[PDB]
Amino acid sequence: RPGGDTIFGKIIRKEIPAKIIFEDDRCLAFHDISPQAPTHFLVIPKKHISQISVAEDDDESLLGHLMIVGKKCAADLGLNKGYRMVVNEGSDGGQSVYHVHLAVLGGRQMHWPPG
Amino acid sequence: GDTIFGKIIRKEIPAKIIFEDDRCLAFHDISPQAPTHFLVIPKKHISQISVAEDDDESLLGHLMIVGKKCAADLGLNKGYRMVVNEGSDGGQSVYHVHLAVLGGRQMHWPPG
Ligand SMILES: Nc1ncnc2c1ncn2[C@@H]1O[C@H](CO)[C@@H](O)[C@H]1O
């Protein structure tokens, strides 16, 4: 509206506060309010895409940008020992907000399997 | 490159291939952690996501779109989880960038 009225769309439009790490014209990185690792943040597109399963072919650059921004933010946040990037899709993926997001978790040893 | 994923790309050792194009390969993981568990990897040898170049941005997105399409082809209509591991804390097992896609069961939180 632009960004939609999911909570993530509201965050994009500064209508709900968030702890922002990085912002550009395509995406926003901000900390997760329910962290599952010592560092846990999200990278979201400003364009509303509900879930990765409905992303268009022409969304490739944008999706890749989420990953590049995620890795840059992880470096800026000092995650020199590594981290895990996660995209949850739908019910089995554990998706809770239908605005696609890349989660980045680090600052501890991550285990296998990844859930 | 110089990892087992390079050997798989070069067809030197076998893998159950799901999809291929000029720039990536998708194949079932040898150690599956879900009823469906596959990888999408670039043919370009990027060792880890932390060293990916800005110019690789659309290639990385291509891995995700290919992962989405393969998931649908493999019947993952209830959802799935995509994972990229970086470094030792991330549990990265092979130093060749890979996007893992897992589904066919409920995935749990935290994701490791
Ligand atoms: N207002 C919010 N600010 C930051 N993260 C959020 C917010 N609401 C939900 N999340 C996080 O989004 C993730 C998936 O929707 C979860 O890890 C959850 O904690």
Side-chain angles (χ1 to χ4, degrees), chain A residues 60 65 84 88 110-111, chain B residues 57 62 81 85 89 107 112:
Chain A
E60 268 186 5
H65 188 58
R84 177 166 293 155
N88 290 344
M110 303 302 292
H111 303 134
Chain B
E57 196 169 84
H62 187 69
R81 176 169 294 158
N85 292 339
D89 273 354
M107 303 303 298

Side-chain angles (χ1 to χ4, degrees), chain B residues 36-40 67 71 76 80-83 99-103:
Chain B
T36 296
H37 181 176
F38 67 91
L39 300 189
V40 190
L76 300 185
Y80 48 82
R81 176 169 294 158
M82 303 179 148
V83 181
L99 177 70
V101 181
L102 301 92

Side-chain angles (χ1 to χ4, degrees), chain A residues 7-8 11 16 30-34 40 42 96-97 101, chain B residues 109:
Chain A
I7 178 140
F8 292 173
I11 287 172
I16 284 180
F30 59 95
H31 293 277
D32 199 292
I33 56 155
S34 181
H40 182 175
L42 296 187
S96 54
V97 178
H101 45 288
Chain B
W109 206 241

Side-chain angles (χ1 to χ4, degrees), chain A residues 63 66-68 70-71 82-87 102-106 110 112 114, chain B residues 37-42 46-52 60-61 63-64 81-87 89-94 96-102 111:
Chain A
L63 292 173
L66 303 181
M67 297 182 51
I68 293 291
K71 72 91 171 172
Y83 49 84
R84 177 166 293 155
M85 300 180 147
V86 181
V87 178
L102 182 73
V104 182
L105 300 89
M110 303 302 292
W112 208 237
Chain B
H37 181 176
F38 67 91
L39 300 189
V40 190
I41 75 176
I46 301 173
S47 58
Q48 60 213 98
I49 194 71
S50 63
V51 305
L60 295 173
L63 306 177
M64 297 179 55
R81 176 169 294 158
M82 303 179 148
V83 181
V84 177
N85 292 339
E86 167 70 29
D89 273 354
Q92 186 180 356
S93 60
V94 176
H96 185 122
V97 162
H98 48 287
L99 177 70
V101 181
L102 301 92

Side-chain angles (χ1 to χ4, degrees), chain A residues 64-95:
Chain A
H65 188 58
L66 303 181
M67 297 182 51
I68 293 291
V69 169
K71 72 91 171 172
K72 293 181 177 174
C73 290
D76 293 346
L77 292 170
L79 304 181
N80 56 45
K81 275 190 63 113
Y83 49 84
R84 177 166 293 155
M85 300 180 147
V86 181
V87 178
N88 290 344
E89 164 70 32
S91 180
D92 276 354
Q95 185 171 8

Side-chain angles (χ1 to χ4, degrees), chain A residues 18-73:
Chain A
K19 301 303 297 186
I20 294 166
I21 304 159
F22 178 82
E23 181 165 359
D24 67 19
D25 58 293
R26 279 196 285 176
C27 75
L28 185 73
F30 59 95
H31 293 277
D32 199 292
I33 56 155
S34 181
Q36 302 295 307
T39 294
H40 182 175
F41 67 91
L42 296 187
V43 190
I44 67 176
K46 287 186 174 183
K47 177 189 174 171
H48 177 69
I49 300 171
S50 59
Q51 58 209 104
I52 189 71
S53 62
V54 302
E56 304 166 86
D57 291 356
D58 295 331
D59 289 321
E60 268 186 5
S61 52
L62 173 61
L63 292 173
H65 188 58
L66 303 181
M67 297 182 51
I68 293 291
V69 169
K71 72 91 171 172
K72 293 181 177 174
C73 290

